[PDB]
């Protein structure tokens, strides 16, 4: 009935994604309807050239990355495409094929930018939101994909030098990987992998003692607590754990954070012999 006439607008916009002369308006409208149309992701994936057009919107801003010149209009446009790609990454009917096409690999350059402008920050957050949507599914293939595409080094750079929100999202991604059994075994497999992660977490504890952040501190502690489940990682943490986690440095900030206090207390008990 009345809702069927709206679906024809959805179909026309998806078809208008192909031609560059009608893509920008179709990107705008479809990103708005991505919450009300549950089956939008399979329609986006299985239509002709739709995903290819979204990859085109991504690659077309690569020249704007270096030198950093990304404008507000460019960042808005490409983030409408990333929004629709996030829709595809979330849907269980298209998530596997999304990963099989290695689509996140073309968002990795965005996570490598260091420009502090809002167009670049809005780009990194949107890109991080795509990866966040992936790990929120708690799927084994999402972990195996991220472990093999070298996204952990990208998160550690963001966790060390990004904005306060960027650090928290990147730490959350690393946390979700660590929570999965395969991710913990992968990072603790060699000392080269583990030591590089523990050093970044250590530097973040020093940064948090100067510039405090409640949510960032919570997920930095969750990462440490998860690492302590592994025997090889537990031995190294006994000599490299920041003293600021064992004394009362974060006593006043954690006063009303019940769960982080519980995690931090479980962490110190795990390291006790």
């Amino acid at each position: 009935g009345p809702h069927m006439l709206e679906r024809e607008k959805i179909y026309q916009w998806i078809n208008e994604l192909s031609s560059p002369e009608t893509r920008e308006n179709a990107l705008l409208e479809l990103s708005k309807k991505r919450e009300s149309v549950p089956d939008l992701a399979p329609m986006l994936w299985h239509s002709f050239g739709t995903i290819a057009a979204l990859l085109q919107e991504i690659v077309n801003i690569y020249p704007s990355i270096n030198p950093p010149t990304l404008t507000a209009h460019q960042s808005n446009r490409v983030c409408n495409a990333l929004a629709l790609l996030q829709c595809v990454a979330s849907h269980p009917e298209t998530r596997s094929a999304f990963l099989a096409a290695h689509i996140p690999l073309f968002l990795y350059p965005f996570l490598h930018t260091v420009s502090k402008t809002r167009p670049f920050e809005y780009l990194r957050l949107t890109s991080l939101g795509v990866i966040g949507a992936l790990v929120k599914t708690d799927e084994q293939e999402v972990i195996n994909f991220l472990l093999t595409t070298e996204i952990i080094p990208l998160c550690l750079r963001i966790m060390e030098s990004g904005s306060e929100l960027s650090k928290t999202v990147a730490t959350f991604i690393l946390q979700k990987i660590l929570l999965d059994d395969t991710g913990l075994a992968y990072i603790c497999q060699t000392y080269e992998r583990f030591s590089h992660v523990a050093m970044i977490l250590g530097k973040m504890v020093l940064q948090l003692s100067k510039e405090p952040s409640a949510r960032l501190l919570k997920h930095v502690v969750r990462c440490y607590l998860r690492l302590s489940d592994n025997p090889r990682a537990r031995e190294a943490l006994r000599q490299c754990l920041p003293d600021q986690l064992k004394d009362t440095t974060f006593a006043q900030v954690l006063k009303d954070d019940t769960t982080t206090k519980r995690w931090l207390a479980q962490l110190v008990k795990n390291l006790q012999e």
């Binding site: 507000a72 957050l125 929120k136």
Partner: peptide, 22 residues
């Protein structure tokens, strides 16, 4: 122009705040 970027930026901050916790 610059208003929509700021509007979209605040919405992403709201979105990522829920995602990281919930």
């Amino acid at each position: 122009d610059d208003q929509q970027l700021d509007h979209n930026f605040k919405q992403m901050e709201e979105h990522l705040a829920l995602m990281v916790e919930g």
